[PDB]
Design a protein around this ligand. Structure first.
Ligand SMILES: CCCCCCSC[C@H](NC(=O)CC[C@H]([NH3+])C(=O)O)C(=O)NCC(=O)O
Ligand SMILES: CCCCCCSC[C@H](NC(=O)CC[C@H]([NH3+])C(=O)O)C(=O)NCC(=O)O
Lengths: 219, 221
């Protein structure tokens, strides 16, 4: 089974949790709880750049979120049929990641910058990102983003939709095809299982969990 | 049928690694330089930019935005992305490390003036203590001339590009890393990369204050 080394939070690992779950792959987590737990990983030679996420998979120890994701996507045939399809996938999921990163640093930003950053994100979802993905879907009228077939792009997008919902349930309301995709993907047996109570899916980061991160990652 | 066309402003920015990679692959390309916010607006209105941003590259009859999408496609097309999934993961791991350090360096002139000095010091420490030791360790592990699969890949190209940037930053930083210095020399001597380093190539200079003002106007920040 793949083993995920991270702290007990969404952070940089949650999209890996989603992708693995969506692929039907059972994994294990080893939760880092302290600065010393992290330092033990570092000491033991487990972390190429002294950082997590790190995933032990197929007998090697992989750091770098995108390295982890690309490998899993390829392995479980969720990265398209060919390099042209991979190009569409990569374009879409990099837009999703840009938005995702913004949503992630929300509580980590200075408190005096939080309001402006939230307003900015909302505007980008409204005017930039949702129109772009709605456009792709309305272009080919198909149930999936690429190749008329489940890909990581669908998984990464729907994950994002859940985060946007948490922010403001109205943001999606003028994008019927995004709403429909959320529903379809969420009803896929693997994803439906991951969405159920008690799965490895992680909650939004609260103030205590942020406090933990500051201790573990020294910031 | 048509050479790739790179849409960006006349500056390194987010396009420089693509310029390096295409040149290293031996691929002639064209550039269409954005001069103003109006030029970027025209791209947006023409429907050429999926997220209303550049870098954008027209290659093989399609428009690609997102630096990583562009690079991934190029690397795969020209067999600079490893021979299998495991080699790809090594490559990805290395180049994402490189990306992290490169962004730190890129965003240095856009730090508020009072944060500028402490940030630099932190960059030097991470170069010395974190990044250069990792890559020196890889080179030492196998003793081969290339990072991955004993064959040229995008990892060698991305890393050597960064070595040149670090040299601009502080020529002393590479000093205790002999294998890194050796990689830089060998890669610089490959016919394609040699041509790219010569005067007059599409390789772009370090970004100066006035270029950065051009970016503030074009990209409205
Ligand atoms: C907003 C919630 C906070 C999320 C937790 C912080 S991520 C922890 C941090 N890891 C990274 O920044 C890895 C970035 C890398 N580019 C990747 O994508 O994997 C780390 O190990 N830091 C230790 C170090 O760099 O020294
Ligand atoms: C240190 C300053 C260096 C100048 C670099 C400017 S990059 C310009 C900017 N592009 C992006 O942020 C693209 C990000 C994207 N994630 C990618 O990798 O391609 C843009 O088009 N912005 C316009 C917009 O987003 O509206």
């Amino acid at each position: 089974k793949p083993k995920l080394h991270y702290f007990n939070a969404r952070g940089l690992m949650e999209s890996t949790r989603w992708l693995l779950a969506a692929a039907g792959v059972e994994f294990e987590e080893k939760f880092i709880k302290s600065a010393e737990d992290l330092d033990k990983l570092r000491n033991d030679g487990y972390l190429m750049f002294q950082q997590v996420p790190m995933v032990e998979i197929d007998g090697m120890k992989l750091v770098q979120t995108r390295a982890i994701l690309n490998y899993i996507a390829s392995k479980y045939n969720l990265y398209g049929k060919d390099i042209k399809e991979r190009a569409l996938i990569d374009m879409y999921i990099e837009g999703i990641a840009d938005l995702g990163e913004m949503i992630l640093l929300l509580p980590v930003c200075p408190p005096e910058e939080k309001d402006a950053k939230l307003a900015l994100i909302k505007e980008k979802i409204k005017n930039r990102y949702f129109p772009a993905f709605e456009k792709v879907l309305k272009s080919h009228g198909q149930d999936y983003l690429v190749g008329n077939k489940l890909s990581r792009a669908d998984i990464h997008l729907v994950e994002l939709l859940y985060y946007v919902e948490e922010l403001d349930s109205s943001l999606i309301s003028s994008f019927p095809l995004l709403k429909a995709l959320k529903t379809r993907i969420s009803n896929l047996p693997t994803v439906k299982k991951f969405l159920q109570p008690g799965s490895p899916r992680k909650p939004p980061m609260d103030e205590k969990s942020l406090e933990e991160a500051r201790k573990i990652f020294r910031f």
